[PDB]
Amino acid sequence: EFQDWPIVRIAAHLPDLIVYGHFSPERPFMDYFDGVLMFVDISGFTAMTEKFSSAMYMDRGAEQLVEILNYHISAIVEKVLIFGGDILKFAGDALLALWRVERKQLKNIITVVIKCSLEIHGLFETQEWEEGLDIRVKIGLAAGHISMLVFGDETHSHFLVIGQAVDDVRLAQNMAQMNDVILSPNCWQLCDRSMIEIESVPDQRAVKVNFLKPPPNFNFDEFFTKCTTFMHYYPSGEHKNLLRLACTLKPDPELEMSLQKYVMESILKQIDNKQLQGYLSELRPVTIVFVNLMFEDQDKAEEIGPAIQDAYMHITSVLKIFQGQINKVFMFDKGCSFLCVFGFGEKVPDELTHALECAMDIFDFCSQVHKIQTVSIGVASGIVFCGIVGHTVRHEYTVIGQKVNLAARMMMYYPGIVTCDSVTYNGSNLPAYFFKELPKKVMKGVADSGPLYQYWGRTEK
Numbered sequence: 001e002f003q004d005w006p007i008v009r010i011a012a013h014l015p016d017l018i019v020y021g022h023f024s025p026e027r028p029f030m031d032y033f034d035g036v037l038m039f040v041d042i043s044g045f046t047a048m049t050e051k052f053s054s055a056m057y058m059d060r061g062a063e064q065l066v067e068i069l070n071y072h073i074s075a076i077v078e079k080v081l082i083f084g085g086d087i088l089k090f091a092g093d094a095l096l097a098l099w100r101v102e103r104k105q106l107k108n109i110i111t112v113v114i115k116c117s118l119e120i121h122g123l124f125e126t127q128e129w130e131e132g133l134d135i136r137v138k139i140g141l142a143a144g145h146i147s148m149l150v151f152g153d154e155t156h157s158h159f160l161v162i163g164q165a166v167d168d169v170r171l172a173q174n175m176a177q178m179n180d181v182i183l184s185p186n187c188w189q190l191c192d193r194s195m196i197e198i199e200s201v202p203d204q205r206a207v208k209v210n211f212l213k214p215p216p217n218f219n220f221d222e223f224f225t226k227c228t229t230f231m232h233y234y235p236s237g238e239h240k241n242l243l244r245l246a247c248t249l250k251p252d253p254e255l256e257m258s259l260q261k262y263v264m265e266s267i268l269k270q271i272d273n274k275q276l277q278g279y280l281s282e283l284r285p286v287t288i289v290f291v292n293l294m295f296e297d298q299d300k301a302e303e304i305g306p307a308i309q310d311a312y313m314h315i316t317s318v319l320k321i322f323q324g325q326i327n328k329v330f331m332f333d334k335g336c337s338f339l340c341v342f343g344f345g346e347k348v349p350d351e352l353t354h355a356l357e358c359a360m361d362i363f364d365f366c367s368q369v370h371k372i373q374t375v376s377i378g379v380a381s382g383i384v385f386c387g388i389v390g391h392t393v394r395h396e397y398t399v400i401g402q403k404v405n406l407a408a409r410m411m412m413y414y415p416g417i418v419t420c421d422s423v424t425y426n427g428s429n430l431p432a433y434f435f436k437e438l439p440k441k442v443m444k445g446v447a448d449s450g451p452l453y454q455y456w457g458r459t460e461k
């Protein structure tokens with residue numbers, strides 16, 4: 001069976017949630033279901049980005065990083081898939097997976113996901129980045145009501161998952177230390193508490209898993225085969241040798257037209273063998289504009305949907321002008337966040353002046369959008385790693401770096417304004433009075449960010 005059709009290559013970049021959906025044309029588009037989520041984080045990892053940016057890597061830093069990374073991540077991906085999960089999203093050291101089930105099946109599916117989780121922890125026992133650096137994971141699990149939001153325009157589409165269970169999975173992840181599997185309160189509440197030994201987490205309703213202790217006669221394999229009965233797209237029969245049913249997709253112009261919109265133009269070029277398969281693995285100077293939109297209530301897709309859609313329409317317009325691109329959209333703890341990048345796009349002059357001006361315009365327009373309570377934008381510039389991360393059958397373009405995290409942290413620790421780093425400040429070729437120098441705040445993940453600035457803009461206001 002031939003399987004290397006462009007449609008199949010495109011679907012590698014997408015979860016089944018999109019690949020096998022049937023969305024109306026309307027934007028936004030909302031859908032509601034139940035399932036279990038797994039949010040996975042790899043340790044020892046800001047440490048790698050540093051290792052690999054050093055001159056010791058002789059200009060093959062991006063290459064070696066992408067390699068060592070995919071080696072470990074693609075092992076995580078195979079597990080998730082074999083355990084019947086759908087990998088929703090990657091970014092950096094982290095990936096999100098979903099086992100979408102009917103509400104009666106949640107209890108049993110939780111047991112699968114827990115087992116999957118302990119097997120992931122077992123991959124990395126006795127396992128190091130380098131001599132003297134352990135690689136470990138932290139896993140958060142959640143279960144419940146989940147909303148999909150799809151937004152975009154006629155040529156580009158994005159999705160997010162929303163709701164308290166998504167919020168719960170992020171909270172369980174943040175609590176988790178290395179080697180932990182943390183359950184949300186609702187996940188603990190819905191699980192088969194006869195099989196699952198836990199301990200409490202101080203100042204938290206969430207729980208940590210110690211052991212999976214099934215009864216004397218329980219057979220995990222037969223229990224899992226019974227759970228696959230409820231999985232629409234688990235590969236089987238003649239296709240039981242395959243990690244994803246998506247690998248059997250056949251040409252279909254309409255579906256391809258739909259899917260390609262989720263994928264960046266430079267990936268499509270590569271998919272089409274019109275660009276070298278290695279061209280995207282790089283260390284490149286870019287400017288990151290990280291835009292955060294806070295809402296009164298970030299679990300109600302009917303509320304935040306239209307606003308995200310409205311904001312997207314503007315952001316995409318302002319970026320086409322100023323020569324940037326949306327790379328990924330995120331739901332953090334607080335808000336919807338757009339990860340925008342200038343430079344790797346064309347490497348253009350006035351990149352910095354343009355990134356700033358583009359931020360202020362986004363900021364002004366978005367602050368006037370109905371349900372948006374607050375807008376926050378962080379702007380940082382520097383060398384970041386770019387590349388396609390994951391498995392052959394499931395992978396996504398991502399950006400990784402101290403500057404990516406710096407912009408992400410600025411927009412959280414300096415809400416309501418546009419902030420920029422020193423690189424951006426000094427290389428802007430704008431007058432100093434378009435800025436204010438800010439209080440130095442201590443920020444999670446960041447060591448000597450350097451002086452930070454508010455982009456005040458042209459007038460006194």
Ligand SMILES: Oc1c(Cl)cc(Cl)cc1Sc1cc(Cl)cc(Cl)c1O
Pocket residue numbers: 039089090091092093094095096159160161166167169170329330331332
């Ligand atoms: O901050 C994130 C990183 Cl580093 C990786 C991934 Cl896969 C996701 C997030 S935030 C986020 C979390 C959930 Cl639970 C769902 C969505 Cl739609 C997100 O963007």
